[PDB]
């Protein structure tokens, strides 16, 4: 993959790093930097290349003074396979990191006190990378059984406060357990940072997967599961009735008895061109 | 046990909400494409300019109403912008997109003064 | 005794004078709402435009003038420039006050003139 | 909801303080600065809560080298009651503070010697921040209680001479009894500073109170005071004669005689809108 | 003078200083950094007000990380009394400060063991400050005496020599005495960077000499002193021969017996307007 | 003895070579002087001139010719650019002057040459 | 004169040197870092002024992070003297250096340990820059040799193959014997790159050889040594088989039967001015 | 034995191939001595320029052509470019030679297609 060998040639780097390289080269923390230096790059290498073969929109590949992040620009757009596929592809490449240090071992070619360093911080990272807190790796895979459960708003809430309660359990954590080790409050405040930032435009992420579902290129096309919905309500509020991966074909009632039976298609066109924005839908059946 | 040493260093993947603002080059392709008719293109130029909106949005604050109802109107503004634009006279898609965004919102903003 | 150990600190509220000038989108809802009634918004236009008479008396100052009258007779044509806005012209209102006042204060020298 | 967010995005600092924190980081003083960076902060943030909670508008909350400030825009404004809760906001979480770091001590998770510099610092801070001097929060409640009194340019003279006289004297202690302390010298050169630029805007915080006077429309209307004036004096001392939260009606005295009273929304209507200023009430009795 | 004022509001301060004063600050050595701050600062502020006095073009007044400056943009134009003038304006201001620190010991408003320590720092910076290196205070004091006494290119180039030697000669006794105190150090490769930077521009320090030279407007007209010339060597190479604050009547010589007497005036105008550069002078007799 | 403290600061005045280039409202007016005859304006703006000459000297480097000549023939041509220039074309000085500059040296070099 | 200065104005600093430096002198490293960057100093401005004086194009002094680098634009150009005695100025200066330190050390101004240290670090870098590999100074002295018995093109394929071979086994070694080694890791990086570019670019420097060749005008003349050529091959393998420094007179081989000399100014004459290229000898033996 | 506190370090001279282009000053220069006579002043010309042929070559890459060929046409063409400058014309030399040089290699180019 040509654009795999292009994403790997422009690897953007923070300065602090360089800072934090010097101070280990001049007291001696040199094998320990490159393993995990090692250990985060293929991490991130495997989510690059699981991401390009799907042909998403990677934009850089970053190297922060604390681990390292792959910046796609695709939210609440996509199949679930596929973002599912995407993610496992990080903690699913671990092994073959371990079986090829272990045979290097076997072969003699690094010591044996070498080994285990390189063991205890592969599988560290791992079991770290797998907390279910948004982003991390374990929430990204909580979301989509959320999802796949239930309807894309309350999902979203629901993943946000379970994450926030969490986060707030391992915040209490460190602070009785272990005061010191900077490295915890480092984690504790960029979660808390990104769950504020996150949660700042939850508006814009439903609009994005509205509009992905307005122009649907009907991507494998799945079931059809009616919604019993009264003609009393609002049509925003009926529109945050819909299932990620499905067709939702509605049924209108009123006063007691359903009037007719309506589609996804002629309510997202009057929605998004008949100016009709909050207004009603009992003159949907015969808007005009 | 071991907990005194563990170095907690994270490694995910980050979902951009608003894709940062296209070229010049492809966008044109992307207009001509519109022009010969697909969803797709379309698609992306409504979603490559939604932090016009978001400005737009976060300037009409000191009033009160809420965000969901602007958000909307913002983007049925962003949508009408794209859809009706000329490129006959001569200027910038983004600043025709902000003058519909800002037209749009002074026109449902009439209404609603006038309903309360 | 217990000093040279204090470190003391300060924590206060610090009112400011001058309101910060209203931005691109403000200043129009303002005068809708006036247009069609409301009173606090002729009450935040005026108050918002008190920076511009804070270096128009001092431009007028080494005369021999006690900066109250001067001061309260540009509040008196800062409120003319604002009852009487026509913003149709295609002109900035800031301009359109200076020269209010500055107009104002000048026609209040030339009566103390004829006056003395 | 969404304000107190709206207010968690106006937050500044100084970046002088920058450097501060990162020379006392490696230095040593780490078990100080947390505790100074918390009082303060939780000091502001009590202000800015309850300035947001009664609807004013909030510019920043920037932190400074040697303490913090918050930036309204209400200047002789608002009524008695609304800045005095404001105010007296600060000088409250001390106690919470307290309570909940002896509460912490108690079930041992922080040393003894830690609890004695905690309390320490914490007492410092709220004592000094009562001192009766422009701005701080004694001058304020002192103002406070001169305006309830007197009329508000008399209350807005002696406040700025008493001010004044307290900080000479605190001068002249510091510069010439005390040895040094680095720490007072600042404290004296801004409170010098601050004093000097409120005296030098004594005219626009009086236009504004009158302006906000005259734009109030049946604003909770309060004591009646009636008051007598001579025909000497022209409209501006009859002016000067007003008090917070108090409506007063006039007595034109003819000579001797006195003729009726004298509406307050006409004197002012005069004043503004019918341009009839540079005159004695003996034109105003005989108007258009 | 009101300019004085403006070059006292407008002090550039380099961002290094900020950094030594926090770290100062965080240690405990204030006192010695504020005599060390006010000496530097008074030592050039009367340099500064000196020249104002003369109405120079003065354009920044700078404190550096290791003392402050006066950016004065006059080289090689003036009269010499305004250049001693400016100079002695430093040396001769410590008198002053010493007397100030004693009166202020006796009354007892400082203590015994500060008085030493400003008046040790004052001594030691005005001794080092008097020493005779390029450009300090005592070169451009010995520069003065020599073009006084020689003209002003052979008095810059024998200037500069003497300024190298002692250079070399400070630069041994500090790598065999001291080779710690990090000041010596500093001090030294500021004086040997300044020397090369200021030997770079010999030509252009003549060239802005001669142009001041033509548009004389006659400042304290003085007296005049004949030059014994040949009428075969160039005229650039005799112009080279003009003594500063002074008048030089040019005698030319042909072939033992002299032709005629030459003034400034018509050789000056030949050479900056008949195009003739490096030439000839023997047919500056009867030019055209 | 008390060698081991002395703190070696420095404190002196620093004479600048070049003087910086100047602006544009009194640079006007020092030509409307010159206009008017004045050797002191003159002087002064040719000496504030001095950096262009100093960066075509040192461009036309890797000749072999020594820098005196240079730089008086450098001098020359500014001064005559200064002299002999035209405000009616509507350009902007500098680039009047290092033209000049250019077209002497560039004529001295074709003499230099032919003469060698 | 004025070259010395034009050089010392053209020395460039890496930026991550000045990071290395600033933690190297917190840490306590200093008595080698002052060592180090003298002799690496000192190695390349023997280089330069050996270069300056034979008048070469120097374009930097740059100084990286793991050594020095003088970079010049003369390759393959200058003849063989000039460059063997540019390339030979590098491993001498050490001699003089520890002469310089051991007479240093004699009268006491430099502990014993710090001699150890100084003297070691001087042999070890003047050891490794004298290993047998492109570019270093090994390198460069092997190619020397071989292009005073090989021709030109041979000369430069048989140093890149066995630079090529060098490195590797270099490689090899370090990666699987040696533990770790950070220092020497970059070593083996930065010769494997300088390696791969230098072969990437095999054919711009024969041309320019070439065109240096045709353009010179008596420059030297020298050593005389008639070739030989077939009927077979085109004028191109003819130019390959020439050698540096010496004039080739060509006997024209018609099939058995010789007809006269070939001057090598009417080859180039035809292949560069005549432009009568893509023909073999005989088209050359009846031109126009 | 030894090893582990070796700090191994590098130095040396790092010949070029393409020396930089030339600025505003010396290929007027250049020129005027190739017009007096000169060959160093041509042998500099058509060294400096280097960098032009060595992009050109590889934009005619995957073709299906050996690299001698390519870039001793492009010399030959730059040559060519180089002896025939007519620089009153108004042009930068850069492009003149640019298209010398790709003109020459088309030429090639048909020439062999006519042959083969
Ligand atoms: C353009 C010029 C550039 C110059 C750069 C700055 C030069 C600074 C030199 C820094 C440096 C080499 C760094 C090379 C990197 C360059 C490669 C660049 C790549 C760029 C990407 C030289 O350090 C030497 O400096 C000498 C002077 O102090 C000292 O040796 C003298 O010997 C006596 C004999 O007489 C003298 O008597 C006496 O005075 C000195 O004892 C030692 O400090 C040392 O030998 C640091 O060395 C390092 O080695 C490693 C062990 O492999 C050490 O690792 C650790 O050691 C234990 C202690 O924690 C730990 O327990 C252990 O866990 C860990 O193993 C480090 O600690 C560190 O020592
Ligand atoms: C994008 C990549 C990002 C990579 C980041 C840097 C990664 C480099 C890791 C650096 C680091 C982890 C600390 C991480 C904290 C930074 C967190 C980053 C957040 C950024 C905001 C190495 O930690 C490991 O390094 C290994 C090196 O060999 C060693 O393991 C050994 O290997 C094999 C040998 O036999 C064996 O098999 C194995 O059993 C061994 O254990 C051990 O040192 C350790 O295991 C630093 O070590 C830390 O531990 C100790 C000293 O040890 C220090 O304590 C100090 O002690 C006092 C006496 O001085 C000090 O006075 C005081 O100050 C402090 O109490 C710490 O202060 C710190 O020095
Ligand atoms: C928005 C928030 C801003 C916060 C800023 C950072 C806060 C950092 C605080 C730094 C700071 C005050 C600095 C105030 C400057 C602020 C003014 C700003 C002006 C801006 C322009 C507080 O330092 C305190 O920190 C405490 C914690 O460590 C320690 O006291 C605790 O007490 C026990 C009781 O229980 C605890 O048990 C125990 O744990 C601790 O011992 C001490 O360190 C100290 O009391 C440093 O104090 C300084 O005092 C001066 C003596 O006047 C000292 O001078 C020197 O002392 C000798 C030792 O060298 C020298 O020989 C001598 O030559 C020299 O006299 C300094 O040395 C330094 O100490
Ligand atoms: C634009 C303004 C610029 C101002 C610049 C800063 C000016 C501030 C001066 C700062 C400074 C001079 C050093 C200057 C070096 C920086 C040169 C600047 C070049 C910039 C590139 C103060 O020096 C004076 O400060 C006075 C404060 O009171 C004290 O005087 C007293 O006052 C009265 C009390 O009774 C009495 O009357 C009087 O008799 C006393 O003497 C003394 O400290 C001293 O006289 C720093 O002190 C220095 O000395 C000693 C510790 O003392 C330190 O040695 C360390 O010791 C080891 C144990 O830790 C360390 O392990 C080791 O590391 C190091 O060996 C030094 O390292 C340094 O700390
Ligand atoms: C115009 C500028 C003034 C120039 C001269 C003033 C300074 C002279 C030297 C004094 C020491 C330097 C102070 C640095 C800080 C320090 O070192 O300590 C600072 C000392 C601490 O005193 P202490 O802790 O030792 O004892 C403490 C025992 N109570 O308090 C000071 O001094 C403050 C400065 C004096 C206050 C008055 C300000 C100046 C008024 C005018 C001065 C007189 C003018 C001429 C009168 C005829
Ligand atoms: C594709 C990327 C490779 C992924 C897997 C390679 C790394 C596995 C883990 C090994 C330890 C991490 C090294 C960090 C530095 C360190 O820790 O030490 C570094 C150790 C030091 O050895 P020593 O000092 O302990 O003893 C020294 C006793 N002589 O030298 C190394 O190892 C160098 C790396 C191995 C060299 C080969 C490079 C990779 C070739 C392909 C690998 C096999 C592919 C699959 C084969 C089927």
Not at chain 1, 51 to 68: N, T
Not at chain 1, 226 to 251: Q, S
Not at chain 2, 54 to 70: P, Q, R, S
Request: hydrophobic content about 50%; glycine content about 4%; charged content about 20%.
């Amino acid at each position: 993959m040509n654009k795999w060998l292009d994403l790997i040639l422009k690897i953007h780097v923070h300065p602090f790093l360089w800072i934090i390289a010097a101070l280990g080269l001049l007291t001696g923390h040199m094998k320990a930097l490159l393993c995990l230096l090692l250990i985060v790059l293929i991490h991130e290498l495997g989510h690059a290349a699981l991401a390009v073969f799907f042909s998403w929109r990677i934009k850089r590949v970053f190297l922060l003074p604390f681990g390292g992040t792959v910046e796609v620009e695709e939210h609440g757009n996509r199949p679930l396979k596929e973002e599912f596929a995407v993610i496992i592809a990080g903690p699913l490449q671990h092994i073959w990191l371990q079986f090829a240090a272990w045979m290097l071992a076997e072969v003699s070619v690094i010591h044996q006190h070498t080994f285990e360093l390189f063991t205890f911080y592969n599988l560290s990272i791992l079991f770290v990378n797998l907390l279910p807190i948004w982003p991390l790796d374990g929430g990204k895979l909580l979301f989509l059984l959320f999802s796949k459960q239930l309807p894309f708003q309350k999902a979203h809430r629901l993943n946000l406060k379970t994450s926030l309660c969490f986060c707030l359990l391992l915040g209490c954590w460190v602070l009785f357990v272990i005061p010191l080790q900077i490295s915890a409050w480092v984690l504790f405040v960029f979660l808390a940072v990104s769950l504020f930032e996150e949660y700042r435009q939850r508006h814009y992420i439903h609009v994005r997967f509205l509009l992905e579902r307005y122009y649907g290129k009907n991507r494998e096309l799945e079931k059809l599961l009616p919604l019993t919905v009264k003609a009393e309500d609002k049509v925003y509020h009926v529109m945050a009735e819909f299932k990620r991966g499905c067709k939702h074909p509605i049924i209108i009632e009123k006063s007691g008895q359903k009037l007719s039976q309506l589609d996804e298609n002629e309510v997202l066109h009057a929605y998004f061109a008949d100016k009709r924005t909050n207004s009603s839908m009992e003159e949907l059946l015969l808007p005009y | 046990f071991v907990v005194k040493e563990l170095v907690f260093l994270v490694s995910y993947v980050k979902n951009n909400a608003f894709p940062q603002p296209l070229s010049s080059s492809e966008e044109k392709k992307y207009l001509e494409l519109m022009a010969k008719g697909d969803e797709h293109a379309r698609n992306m130029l409504i979603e490559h300019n939604l932090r016009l909106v978001a400005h737009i949005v976060k300037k009409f604050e000191n009033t009160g109403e809420d965000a969901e109802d602007l958000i909307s109107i913002g983007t049925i503004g962003l949508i009408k912008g794209i859809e009706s634009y000329s490129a006959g006279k001569g200027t910038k898609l983004a600043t025709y997109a902000a003058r519909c965004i800002e037209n749009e919102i002074l026109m449902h903003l009439r209404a609603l003064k006038k309903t309360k």
